[PDB]
UniProtKB/Swiss-Prot annotation, chain A:
It is found in: Cytoplasm; Nucleus. The chain holds residues 365 to 418 of 418 of the full protein. The modification N6-acetyllysine is found at K33, K37. Component of the 26S proteasome, a multiprotein complex involved in the ATP-dependent degradation of ubiquitinated proteins. This complex plays a key role in the maintenance of protein homeostasis by removing misfolded or damaged proteins, which could impair cellular functions, and by removing proteins whose functions are no longer required. Therefore, the proteasome participates in numerous cellular processes, including cell cycle progression, apoptosis, or DNA damage repair. The gene is PSMC4. Component of the 19S proteasome regulatory particle complex. The 26S proteasome consists of a 20S core particle (CP) and two 19S regulatory subunits (RP). The regulatory particle is made of a lid composed of 9 subunits, a base containing 6 ATPases including PSMC4 and few additional components. Interacts with NR1I3. Interacts with PAAF1. Interacts with TRIM5. Interacts with ZFAND1. Belongs to the AAA ATPase family. This is 26S proteasome regulatory subunit 6B.
From Swiss-Prot, chain B:
The keyword Protein biosynthesis does not apply. GO terms for biological process: proteasome-mediated ubiquitin-dependent protein catabolic process; response to virus. This is Proteasome subunit alpha type-2. Component of the 20S core proteasome complex involved in the proteolytic degradation of most intracellular proteins. This complex plays numerous essential roles within the cell by associating with different regulatory particles. Associated with two 19S regulatory particles, forms the 26S proteasome and thus participates in the ATP-dependent degradation of ubiquitinated proteins. Transmembrane segments: none annotated. NCBIfam families: PRK03996.1 (NF003075).
Curated annotation (Swiss-Prot), chain C:
This is Proteasome subunit alpha type-6. The modification Phosphoserine is found at S12, S58, S59. GO terms for biological process: positive regulation of canonical NF-kappaB signal transduction; proteasome-mediated ubiquitin-dependent protein catabolic process; proteolysis involved in protein catabolic process; regulation of inflammatory response. The gene is PSMA6. GO terms for molecular function: endopeptidase activity; NF-kappaB binding; purine ribonucleoside triphosphate binding; RNA binding.
From Swiss-Prot, chain E:
Belongs to the peptidase T1A family. The 26S proteasome consists of a 20S proteasome core and two 19S regulatory subunits. The 20S proteasome core is a barrel-shaped complex made of 28 subunits that are arranged in four stacked rings. The two outer rings are each formed by seven alpha subunits, and the two inner rings are formed by seven beta subunits. The proteolytic activity is exerted by three beta-subunits PSMB5, PSMB6 and PSMB7. Interacts with AURKB. Interacts with CDKN1A. Interacts with MDM2 and RB1. Interacts with the C-terminus of TBXA2R isoform 2. Interacts with DNAJB2. GO terms for biological process: proteasome-mediated ubiquitin-dependent protein catabolic process. It is found in: Cytoplasm; Nucleus. The gene is PSMA3. InterPro entries: Ntn_hydrolases_N, Proteasome_alpha, Proteasome_alpha-type, Proteasome_asu_N, Proteasome_sua/b. The modification Phosphoserine is found at S238. One of its GO terms (molecular function) is ubiquitin protein ligase binding. Keywords: Acetylation, Cytoplasm, Host-virus interaction, Nucleus, Phosphoprotein, Proteasome. It comes from Homo sapiens (Human). The lineage of its organism: Eukaryota, Metazoa, Chordata, Craniata, Vertebrata. One of its GO terms (cellular component) is cytosol. This is Proteasome subunit alpha type-3. Induction: Down-regulated by antioxidants BO-653 and probucol. Up-regulated by bacterial lipopolysaccharides (LPS) and TNF. Its main location: cytoplasm. The modification N6-acetyllysine is found at K52, K201, K225.
Amino acid sequence: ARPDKISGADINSICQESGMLAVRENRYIVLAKDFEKAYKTVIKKDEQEHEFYK
Amino acid sequence: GYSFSLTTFSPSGKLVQIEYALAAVAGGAPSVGIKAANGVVLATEKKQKSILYDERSVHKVEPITKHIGLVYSGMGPDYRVLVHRARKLAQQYYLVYQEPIPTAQLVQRVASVMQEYTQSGGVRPFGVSLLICGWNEGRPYLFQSDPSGAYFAWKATAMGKNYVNGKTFLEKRYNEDLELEDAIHTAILTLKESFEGQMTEDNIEVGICNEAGFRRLTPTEVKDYLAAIA
Amino acid sequence: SAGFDRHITIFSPEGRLYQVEYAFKAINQGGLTSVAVRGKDCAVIVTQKKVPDKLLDSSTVTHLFKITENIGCVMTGMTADSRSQVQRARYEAANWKYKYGYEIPVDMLCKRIADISQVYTQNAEMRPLGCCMILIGIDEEQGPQVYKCDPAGYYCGFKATAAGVKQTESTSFLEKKVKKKFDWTFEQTVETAITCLSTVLSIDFKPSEIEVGVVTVENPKFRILTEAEIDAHLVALAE
Amino acid sequence: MADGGSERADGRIVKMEVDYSATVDQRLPECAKLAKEGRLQEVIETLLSLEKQTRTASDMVSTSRILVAVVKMCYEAKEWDLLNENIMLLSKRRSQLKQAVAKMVQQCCTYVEEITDLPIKLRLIDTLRMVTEGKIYVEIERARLTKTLATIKEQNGDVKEAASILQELQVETYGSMEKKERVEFILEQMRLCLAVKDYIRTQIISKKINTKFFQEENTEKLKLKYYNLMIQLDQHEGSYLSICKHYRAIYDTPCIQAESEKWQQALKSVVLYVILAPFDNEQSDLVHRISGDKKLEEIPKYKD
Amino acid sequence: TGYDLSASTFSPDGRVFQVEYAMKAVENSSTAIGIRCKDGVVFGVEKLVLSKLYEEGSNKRLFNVDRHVGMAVAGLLADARSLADIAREEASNFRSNFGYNIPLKHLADRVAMYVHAYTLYSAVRPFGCSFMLGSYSVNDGAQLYMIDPSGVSYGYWGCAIGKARQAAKTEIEKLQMKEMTCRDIVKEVAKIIYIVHDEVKDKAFELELSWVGELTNGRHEIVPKDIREEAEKYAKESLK
Amino acid sequence: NQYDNDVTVWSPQGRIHQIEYAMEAVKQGSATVGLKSKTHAVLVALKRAQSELAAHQKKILHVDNHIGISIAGLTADARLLCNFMRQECLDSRFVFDRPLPVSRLVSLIGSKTQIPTQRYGRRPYGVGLLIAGYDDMGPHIFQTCPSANYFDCRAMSIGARSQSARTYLERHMSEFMECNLNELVKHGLRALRETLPAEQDLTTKNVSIGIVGKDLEFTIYDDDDVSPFLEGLEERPQ
């Protein structure tokens, strides 16, 4: 439901950075904080918006 | 790297700055409009970006007179400009003739305005495609325009994202003879074919045109009707 | 892409124009944050100041511009566009008051300002005034209002409103905060505004940096708060 | 400010020795304003270390008297506010907490001999917040080991403190590196899974045992003393073939010992676990890898 | 580096490079500072003779716009002359339409809109000037404003325009500015201007000091600087 | 250098080079020298010709009963500012019925030349004005520039190789202030005889002198009241 548009490799980039960020805590168990940290360290650049002109 | 700008033709083709405005129209929010036997149904697709926005401030379906509806698929900031122009022009017609303006004369004059902006050479065209309708002298009408100044006449059409897919559904689903309610049913069907999965009383915004006049429906009856209409 | 080097206001292929979506971060060169909130019969503006100098004054750094006696606003982006837009707003509100005999509703003013920006956008050979404007006001039979005007000429208006530099994060907090259905009893509004700016910027600072503009349906006049009562609200949310 | 903490500390050390904590009520907004000031590198950090040491003098006065803990929880309420209006980003200002809470656990060492159960575990329900919320320390993690150890010693080991140790096992192996004392905490849940008698939870915490490798070099004989617990790991519940490292770690514990009885049970249990392990490749030659001990052929059961 | 040609166009990162280049045009100009006291506003400009061809009393950057307002310009001189004429015209319209003295906020806002209007379009360039505006009134006190080349106009206690913009306000701000009347501030500005650039890059400079406040009863004029001669007998005591 | 075409464009070093090019167009005029005493202002220019047989292109031209200008550079803009000058003179001579002070006239000249230096569509004026006049406070010697940054002096000199003239003006600007008309004019041509290469000498037909006095109306002279001015000299120190 977020209009991420993150073409179908970088789901694994989310998976890599998120799970290995849990490896900074060395837990194998996944939070929702992985999703926020992998939505503010991935293609959060362009974004989101522009929502003018349609 | 050519054409650039608006004053000179291509080596063989067309007016690239109008084709790009048409592409910007085709990249816009979807809409559908159907001419039935007694009335015309317009329907747009209005998604807020966040959960913060209000649905009582900006309006897509917009009346030009008490019996003439008009939607678009493009940019609101140009839409409001040419809406205001059409307002003033229709009231000038009613000053001159003391009679509510017919829709063909509206489409002629609005097309003249858009054409005058397509003339050279400093202003850009509108990134707006209209869908004009009204019930003049019994028979209702439906007139689509475009940024190029042209106009058409439809029985049912669509504009926006996946207008090709919605149109191929319109060719299969729609016919010649319906009523306004069945028109709204097939209109919300063909808009629900292409819109997102969450369609509520606010994501759509629907106005109709009976012979008794234009009517812009409320979220009450829109939520009553699209509460799983099929 | 371009290619066309996007020098003037034309349409590029597929399908956008680049002048306005370069103007959308002329706000971002301001280095500034603004938050508006509508919960109930009040409306609150909050915006900080970035004054590094002791030789510089403090009264004339004000961004809250009282448009009319019942309509306030705040500006971000570059300053000259903002102030010129503000005098256009005042002039057109006075034109409303002259022509039509009564006080302008805040909707028509945003429509007129958006139309001016669209005419500045439609015709070329003029810079498209790269500043963003948030308005507030009280209207009878509608309560309070909060509106936003774009440099493109796209007005909208809504409950919890934010524009500037860091407002993807502000709207993320306002989606995570305006989802619970409690009422907003004016100190709920002031507390949520101060704490939303205090979580976006994460500073937790003196009462002398932010500016608070409020309007309420008890005194429909626009009102700018004083250091004492700003300090009162700040220690009232200090637990 | 520096002089503004100087005059306050050096002129409010005095009134602790006589008066009730009305001057601590008249220090609550003073420490609040000095923490709001809170200069960056060391200044009001150390000034607040001084003034919270004199707050521990007020803790002597009031929380050494009737052990009320309302004065304690009021002092941790003003610490809660002092920690809330002042972010402490690790912008080099935390030491208002450091020796404060280290003297609080020094108080808790005077209190585990002095105080009863309720106000010490109210101090602990405060410092759970303080340390698992305020930038997790190193020695108040060791004091966290001893304070949740006191929550264990409350009813001396149960399912509830087994849940406490199984929530506090693997959280701070990763924030502050350590090899000695947290290992002496991680030994302690095996009796907390034996006094509930769960051998498969004993093997889950044995997965927690063998994730702590490089046991050696820490002190002189810490891990040869830990082999007692490493053989209690699968001593009597022990099966027949997963037990070779087990029943060899029985033997290197009396390797220091010149004894002839407790080292003789090491000889006989490194030689009589072959009768546990069925026909194997390690068996028929490991019996002669271990053969070559001088005291080994002086047992008729070894000849048998 | 672009895309830097027109004054209408934006950049790929969103700013107008014409305005920046016009802002750093005044950076090479002469150093001009200003400061107000509790009953007046004092101007001061480091002005330089070319070699020996001047007349010490030509082309004075201290203009005189209204009866109580004058400029302290720095930058391109003729553009400042035209802008001063526009300011005289605006004060003329206000005096003709309302019968009393122009408030400095309103004057500064009209001038800022005029400068912004020259920054907007593509046919014209932005101004290459940066000037000061001081005032005094019996019901308003002392007001000192400041207009950049872009058109951002707000207020100060002290300012500096020129090369040593930071290097003046380093020791401007250590002045006890509130508790002093301006007759001390005259030799204060003298020592501030005399500190910067005695002989280093150029050969010789010369001082002008403008002066408005309560002591002039609301008038604005240059000091009789030869009267009380406050620079040199203290400038020779400011080298040690 | 692709930013270096029009007036509107600021440079990335902030120096609009069209102004610099107009300055260099001023630097290729004829030499001329203007200098004043306490009571009399004298400006002296140098003539040139297209060929031997033709007459010399004149530089000192009349403006008004107490105003006269020298010139260097373009001549269309020269006559344009001449007509504007005469127009503004007879405008105030009509309205106020007084002679103009010089400073407000030259401020009007700067405000006139401001517009072609800021908008697009006119060039900066290649012009070399040296203005002599009489207000109530005596003679004034002003100069202009294509950047409209007009100067007041006591003795200037613009045109080709005019710097040796400036050195002479440096070493006699203290001496200028006391003398009457005759040796003042011969100081002016003891600047002009160093504005020339040394292998040729200033003759009659190539020099021009215009005196305005506190009681003397502005008057141009050519060869015949200049034959009195050319004697009273020695040779150059060869």
